[PDB]
Amino acid sequence: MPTLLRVYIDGPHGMGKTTTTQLLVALGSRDDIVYVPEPMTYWRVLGASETIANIYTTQHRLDQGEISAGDAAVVMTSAQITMGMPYAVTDAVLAPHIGGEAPPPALTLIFDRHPIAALLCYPAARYLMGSMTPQAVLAFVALIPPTLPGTNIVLGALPEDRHIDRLAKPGERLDLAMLAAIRRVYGLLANTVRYLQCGGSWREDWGQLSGNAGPRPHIGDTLFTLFRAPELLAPNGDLYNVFAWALDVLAKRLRSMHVFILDYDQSPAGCRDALLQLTSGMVQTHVTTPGSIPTICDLARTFAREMGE
Amino acid sequence: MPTLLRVYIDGPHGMGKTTTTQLLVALGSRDDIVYVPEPMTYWRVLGASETIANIYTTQHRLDQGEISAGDAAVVMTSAQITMGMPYAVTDAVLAPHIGGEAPPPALTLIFDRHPIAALLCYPAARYLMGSMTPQAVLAFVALIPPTLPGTNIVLGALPEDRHIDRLAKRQRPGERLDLAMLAAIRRVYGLLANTVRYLQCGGSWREDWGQLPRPHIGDTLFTLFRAPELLAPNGDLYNVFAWALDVLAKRLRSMHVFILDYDQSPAGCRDALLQLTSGMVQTHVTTPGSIPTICDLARTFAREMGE
Numbered sequence A: 001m002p003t004l005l006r007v008y009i010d011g012p013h014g015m016g017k018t019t020t021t022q023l024l025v026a027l028g029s030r031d032d033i034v035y036v037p038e039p040m041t042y043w044r045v046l047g048a049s050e051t052i053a054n055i056y057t058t059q060h061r062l063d064q065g066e067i068s069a070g071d072a073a074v075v076m077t078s079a080q081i082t083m084g085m086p087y088a089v090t091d092a093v094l095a096p097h098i099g100g101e102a103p104p105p106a107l108t109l110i111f112d113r114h115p116i117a118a119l120l121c122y123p124a125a126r127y128l129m130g131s132m133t134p135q136a137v138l139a140f141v142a143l144i145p146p147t148l149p150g151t152n153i154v155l156g157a158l159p160e161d162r163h164i165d166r167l168a169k170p171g172e173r174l175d176l177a178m179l180a181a182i183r184r185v186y187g188l189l190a191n192t193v194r195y196l197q198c199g200g201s202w203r204e205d206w207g208q209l210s211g212n213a214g215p216r217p218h219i220g221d222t223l224f225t226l227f228r229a230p231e232l233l234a235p236n237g238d239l240y241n242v243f244a245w246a247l248d249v250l251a252k253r254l255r256s257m258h259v260f261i262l263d264y265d266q267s268p269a270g271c272r273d274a275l276l277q278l279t280s281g282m283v284q285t286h287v288t289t290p291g292s293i294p295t296i297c298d299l300a301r302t303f304a305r306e307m308g309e
Numbered sequence B: 001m002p003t004l005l006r007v008y009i010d011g012p013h014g015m016g017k018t019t020t021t022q023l024l025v026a027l028g029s030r031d032d033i034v035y036v037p038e039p040m041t042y043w044r045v046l047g048a049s050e051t052i053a054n055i056y057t058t059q060h061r062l063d064q065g066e067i068s069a070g071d072a073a074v075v076m077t078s079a080q081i082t083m084g085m086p087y088a089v090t091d092a093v094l095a096p097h098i099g100g101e102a103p104p105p106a107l108t109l110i111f112d113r114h115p116i117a118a119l120l121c122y123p124a125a126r127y128l129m130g131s132m133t134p135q136a137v138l139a140f141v142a143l144i145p146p147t148l149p150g151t152n153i154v155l156g157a158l159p160e161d162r163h164i165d166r167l168a169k170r171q172r173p174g175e176r177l178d179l180a181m182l183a184a185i186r187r188v189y190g191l192l193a194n195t196v197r198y199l200q201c202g203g204s205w206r207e208d209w210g211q212l213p214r215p216h217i218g219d220t221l222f223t224l225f226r227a228p229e230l231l232a233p234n235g236d237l238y239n240v241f242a243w244a245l246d247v248l249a250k251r252l253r254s255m256h257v258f259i260l261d262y263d264q265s266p267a268g269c270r271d272a273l274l275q276l277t278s279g280m281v282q283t284h285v286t287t288p289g290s291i292p293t294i295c296d297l298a299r300t301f302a303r304e305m306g307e
């Protein structure tokens, strides 16, 4: 029974994730490590017209006082559903091939981002920016697919000052406020997994909210803190049950994830070797049939050819 | 482990779907069959303000030429997320309580609609109405939750004329009587039923794609996706959309469809639905506390998001 290692490189854009990944795939053998790359093609052409460009234009207009929140919200919600579609189909066709958690893997699968990037992280950041409702953020949360065994997610670390300079180097605009928001979000996320793996329970700690490594963070330091918003609160001050249930889904999805932190404050070859060492402590899985491996290989290869830049 | 029967009452709206169900929960014991009703309060207040009204005003403005198809699509996409949220959250918290396939069940759970109504059927109809992109529809399709065992879906049969009449007699808040939408939504559901049969008799969309004892691929939902937006310059579907179609195939193939004839009295419908249950597939729950956890979920849902 052959084995599989899946690794999702995620976190805020502009750190160097894409390069580092490509650098890592390059060191490997042709037929034992594949890359599912960033689907910019879907973003700029196939899915719609310059989705990246559309998003930053609308945020800028909202800030400039040129459209209202409600208007910006519907534009952001649409574009983001679109942004995330390739991650979602990929997860869906792959799911049946994944077995139980399990010596060198017969195949390593590297992903540019994980479904929560588009179904949770960026939405949450847009909400912080005032360009998306928390209800819609939670509707995205409710559609996060089941976390499969051996979900290794690598997030980035990088000083803000250096992050600002590197990013200043699609259709994007330099939105420091966005950068700050997405940085905060991925920060809460890493805390949240830690919070949940240390047996934390958002229901039991909900009142404490108001005005891989380490100890259990405070609930105020996790994603749960974002959804203490008046839109989601009943008169009695509690969360409406429907929203509570989506927080439950959030906990169920995150708690079983293996989070790793990668330092991007170094050269491109540095990040690569850092990442390589980091893989040996990652959870592998068995596949479900013998032919899962070449099948998985074709899908990843098919994807890159079509959607990678 | 104790057994569970899940029954999703679905199909196009305006046929009798709600009245019918209400008569059935009346018959069975209040603590032997539970009901998850239409989340009108979420659609009208909690998720956003008057979502139904927003949907229909927007189609109308697109029809009157007051806004662009592009503008319509974004609003439509956004609002349909809002419509589907309670369905999606419910399935997600219920899933771990569902076990394998299984004598009368320990609990019978009846829903007003299944998640594919908001993630496939309604969006597809809006696509036929020019107010949603086919990409968006496929993006919803990709997010369809996995099909758990015992997924029994009841769809309705009713001649269009009777259907028009009943829908006219019970519009929802903000809804606009629209015969194009009605024909769009009826067709989507007819294709749905045909799609399941096609799949279940071993149809393979990839094989029969060229053609664009089972239905013809041209009478399934796969025909809706020959759209030019999804095709490469040589006529092939991009692989990304092809995979969404594999997902659609996997999800639909293992659902169990039952057709309810609505062309009768509300009490006739109730009896019919009841007899329809002998062929439905039961499952085991997964934990001794699943049954009461499910009951409390249902009543909590009803209490909060019911009208």
Ligand SMILES: COc1nc(C=C(CO)CO)c(C)c(OC)n1
Pocket (backbone or CB within 6 Å): A013, A014, A038, A052, A055, A079, A080, A081, A083, A084, A113, A117, A118, A119, A122, A123
């Ligand atoms: C910029 O908006 C936005 N960016 C991304 C990520 C990008 C481009 O910012 C890949 O770097 C994602 C995943 C997203 O998901 C909804 N939304």
Ligand SMILES: COc1nc(C=C(CO)CO)c(C)c(OC)n1
Pocket (backbone or CB within 6 Å): B012, B013, B014, B038, B052, B055, B080, B081, B083, B084, B113, B117, B118, B119, B122, B123, B172
């Ligand atoms: C009217 O628009 C619309 N209605 C429905 C269903 C209704 C009728 O408004 C309840 O039958 C659904 C599920 C939906 O899903 C996106 N969109």
